[PDB]
Amino acid sequence: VRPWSEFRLTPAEAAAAAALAARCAQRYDETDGPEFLLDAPVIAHELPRRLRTFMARARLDAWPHALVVRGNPVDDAALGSTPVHWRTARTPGSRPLSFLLMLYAGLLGDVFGWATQQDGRVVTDVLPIKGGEHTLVSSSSRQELGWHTEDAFSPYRADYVGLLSLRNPDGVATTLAGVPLDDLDERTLDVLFQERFLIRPDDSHLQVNNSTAQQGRVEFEGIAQAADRPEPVAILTGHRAAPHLRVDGDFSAPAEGDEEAAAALGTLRKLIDASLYELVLDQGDVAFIDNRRAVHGRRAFQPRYDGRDRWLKRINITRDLHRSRKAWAGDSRVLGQR
Amino acid sequence: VRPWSEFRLTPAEAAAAAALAARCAQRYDETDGPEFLLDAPVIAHELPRRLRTFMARARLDAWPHALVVRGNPVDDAALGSTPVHWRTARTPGSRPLSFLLMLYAGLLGDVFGWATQQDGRVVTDVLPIKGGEHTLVSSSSRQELGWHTEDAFSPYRADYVGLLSLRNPDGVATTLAGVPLDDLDERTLDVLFQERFLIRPDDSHLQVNNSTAQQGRVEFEGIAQAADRPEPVAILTGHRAAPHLRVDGDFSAPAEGDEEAAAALGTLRKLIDASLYELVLDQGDVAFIDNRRAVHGRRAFQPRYDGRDRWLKRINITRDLHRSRKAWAGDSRVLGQR
Numbered sequence: 001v002r003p004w005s006e007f008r009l010t011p012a013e014a015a016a017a018a019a020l021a022a023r024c025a026q027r028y029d030e031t032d033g034p035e036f037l038l039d040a041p042v043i044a045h046e047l048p049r050r051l052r053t054f055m056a057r058a059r060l061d062a063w064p065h066a067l068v069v070r071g072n073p074v075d076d077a078a079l080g081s082t083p084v085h086w087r088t089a090r091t092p093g094s095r096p097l098s099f100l101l102m103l104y105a106g107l108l109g110d111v112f113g114w115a116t117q118q119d120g121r122v123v124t125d126v127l128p129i130k131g132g133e134h135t136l137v138s139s140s141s142r143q144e145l146g147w148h149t150e151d152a153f154s155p156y157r158a159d160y161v162g163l164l165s166l167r168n169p170d171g172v173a174t175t176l177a178g179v180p181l182d183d184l185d186e187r188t189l190d191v192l193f194q195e196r197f198l199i200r201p202d203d204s205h206l207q208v209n210n211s212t213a214q215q216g217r218v219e220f221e222g223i224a225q226a227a228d229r230p231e232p233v234a235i236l237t238g239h240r241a242a243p244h245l246r247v248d249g250d251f252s253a254p255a256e257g258d259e260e261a262a263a264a265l266g267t268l269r270k271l272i273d274a275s276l277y278e279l280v281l282d283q284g285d286v287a288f289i290d291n292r293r294a295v296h297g298r299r300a301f302q303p304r305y306d307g308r309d310r311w312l313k314r315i316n317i318t319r320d321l322h323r324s325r326k327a328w329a330g331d332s333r334v335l336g337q338r
Numbered sequence: 339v340r341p342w343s344e345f346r347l348t349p350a351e352a353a354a355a356a357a358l359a360a361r362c363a364q365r366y367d368e369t370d371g372p373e374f375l376l377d378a379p380v381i382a383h384e385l386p387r388r389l390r391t392f393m394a395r396a397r398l399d400a401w402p403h404a405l406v407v408r409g410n411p412v413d414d415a416a417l418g419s420t421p422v423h424w425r426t427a428r429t430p431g432s433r434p435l436s437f438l439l440m441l442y443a444g445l446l447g448d449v450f451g452w453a454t455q456q457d458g459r460v461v462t463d464v465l466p467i468k469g470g471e472h473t474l475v476s477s478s479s480r481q482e483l484g485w486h487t488e489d490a491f492s493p494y495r496a497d498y499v500g501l502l503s504l505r506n507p508d509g510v511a512t513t514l515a516g517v518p519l520d521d522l523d524e525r526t527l528d529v530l531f532q533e534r535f536l537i538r539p540d541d542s543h544l545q546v547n548n549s550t551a552q553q554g555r556v557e558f559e560g561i562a563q564a565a566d567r568p569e570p571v572a573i574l575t576g577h578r579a580a581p582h583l584r585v586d587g588d589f590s591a592p593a594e595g596d597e598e599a600a601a602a603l604g605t606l607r608k609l610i611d612a613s614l615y616e617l618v619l620d621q622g623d624v625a626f627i628d629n630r631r632a633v634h635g636r637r638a639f640q641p642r643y644d645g646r647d648r649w650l651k652r653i654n655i656t657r658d659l660h661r662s663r664k665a666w667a668g669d670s671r672v673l674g675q676r
């Protein structure tokens with residue numbers, strides 16, 4: 001069995017999808033422009049029908065932790081070297097694949113970015129940054145990226161996180177875990193459903209991990225409020241037989257002095273640690289991780305820094321953009337508050 | 339200006355959409371079968387491109403209370419007489435248009451029904467029922483159907499309510515109103531955002547307005563719990579500059595003894611009453627009402643009972659089916675709890 005839903009493109013289907021993305025790259029200036037943001041969901045209707053059927057059906061299944069699409073061709077010579085930083089990572093060689101990721105994402109929902117993450121970009125980059133090996137952000141390497149709900153601190157966090165592997169020569173594993181419902185006793189479950197936990201914003205939302213500019217500066221103040229004064233929230237929500245999950249192994253805490261909540265979180269930690277499994281995104285594989293059913297991370301790896309490091313394109317997806325309307329900057333798709 | 343977003347099909351576009359719906363009616367046994375429920379969203383990708391662009395873009399706009407599509411051809415001779423009851427309302431003449439409504443709905447989200455409403459049907463019927471002129475349900479006529487959020491009692495209520503006019507010879511108006519934000523003072527607004535109100539299920543969820551059978555019987559018990567023991571909820575949620583609305587003019591009440599909450603609800607009533615406007619769905623018009631931004635109703639009218647009464651097909655749409663997973667019966671798209 002597999003805890004995720006998987007689809008493998010035929011070479012013909014993969015070529016057709018690539019051709020469509022290349023056409024988009026020819027017609028539009030960038031992926032994050034207002035034009036392509038609006039058009040991509042409709043252009044995505046031209047993708048191979050079997051893939052559209054998979055994405056429409058698999059999203060509605062009750063069980064999978066992710067939707068995985070294998071077999072998108074990538075030519076390393078055409079792609080070029082892995083960027084040394086996300087700032088300069090919008091290379092011409094990676095451009096068609098960025099368009100491709102957004103097309104696939106459009107079949108699942110409304111894409112968006114954060115003003116406080118990688119300069120408000122919608123399509124972001126995951127790659128190892130020299131000197132940042134032992135950090136809590138996606139550009140880490142030597143230190144394992146601990147399991148987490150994406151942007152757990154925020155009520156506007158994605159429903160799906162898309163990851164497209166541009167290259168991964170050494171097969172470094174993405175980690176995943178669902179709610180450990182087979183082992184959570186009812187008392188512990190009861191406590192996890194109560195608003196007795198604190199969840200602060202991760203380090204990617206700090207100014208230090210963004211470019212030196214006034215572009216999207218006011219949104220960093222809302223990150224500070226979330227870090228300094230986190231209101232108590234629940235870890236589990238919804239149906240007790242299939243709960244949605246909101247937790248971060250490195251940024252979650254119990255409400256101050258609440259030892260019963262602490263015990264529940266401690267138990268949850270051990271159960272997620274013990275059930276954590278691996279998904280290897282080989283070059284050309286795309287995963288859309290269900291950010292409500294599963295937490296995810298990335299195994300520790302030794303970075304190369306020789307031009308062929310592991311490199312993913314990444315995108316946040318929500319089923320309903322209007323859920324985050326308080327955090328809207330304007331007509332843009334870049335979220336944040338004060 | 340218009341408070342809703344409007345689209346008029348060209349005759350060619352309308353004919354193409356009709357042709358697609360007719361093809362679906364030929365290929366599938368019914369609209370509510372598991373097959374067409376799953377396929378309709380992908381088949382909808384074959385609708386006229388200008389319409390798909392409208393639906394993709396208009397849904398993301400911040401302002402409209404509804405998305406209105408004009409100009410679907412309807413032949414009264416082909417359609418046949420208006421049914422005397424919803425039970426027998428799945429007539430061959432109305433079948434293609436039911437498929438059409440579901441195709442359009444598939445562009446906006448996941449369709450669903452309620453076990454306690456019209457025998458769990460996904461595509462439901464709005465028509466006057468003889469002897470039921472002065473009721474609080476959609477089959478009323480002589481008594482105005484007061485403004486309401488659809489299924490306000492439930493946290494699984496639709497994001498969009500679709501209404502397709504099969505006929506409306508006397509131009510009876512659907513009523514609509516947004517949040518009266520131009521007139522709500524901040525104190526009143528503050529109170530409406532607090533969990534100080536009760537909202538009970540409407541009369542369409544009662545057993546008396548469903549067929550005599552054991553089909554979907556356990557779900558009526560959850561309706562009783564909502565009616566007997568309503569937990570306090572808010573009327574307004576989300577962004578204060580653009581709140582989402584949850585209210586029913588005939589089923590909302592303040593929390594017991596809460597006079598400040600009562601004052602706020604009383605004020606809201608008068609402001610919605612005063613700002614209520616009309617939308618006439620002529621034969622062939624389809625409206626997708628934003629059930630979070632607007633309340634809606636229907637003007638009082640004199641029923642004919644001569645075979646040509648006003649008749650709509652209706653459908654509930656959610657942006658995320660998994661929001662209601664506690665209320666899932668099984669793999670079906672019919673909601674309810676105990």
Ligand SMILES: NC(=[NH2+])NCCC[C@H](N)C(=O)O
Binds near residue numbers: 136139147248
């Ligand atoms: N436990 C954690 N490391 N949480 C933060 C995860 C990494 C973060 N989502 C980023 O893009 O950098």
Ligand SMILES: NC(=[NH2+])NCCC[C@H](N)C(=O)O
Binds near residue numbers: 475477484486542
């Ligand atoms: N205030 C009201 N009348 N609320 C109930 C509205 C009618 C209900 N949605 C039905 O289908 O019959």
Ligand SMILES: O=C(O)CCC(=O)C(=O)O
Binds near residue numbers: 145174
């Ligand atoms: O590198 C990976 O596979 C996971 C990256 C990740 O968790 C993130 O960017 O949020």
Ligand SMILES: O=C(O)CCC(=O)C(=O)O
Binds near residue numbers: 501511
């Ligand atoms: O008849 C109309 O136009 C409105 C019907 C309605 O409000 C409903 O069926 O929920």
Ligand SMILES: [Fe+2]
Binds near residue numbers: 149150
């Ligand atoms: Fe992540």
Ligand SMILES: [Fe+2]
Binds near residue numbers: 486487488634635
């Ligand atoms: Fe209604």
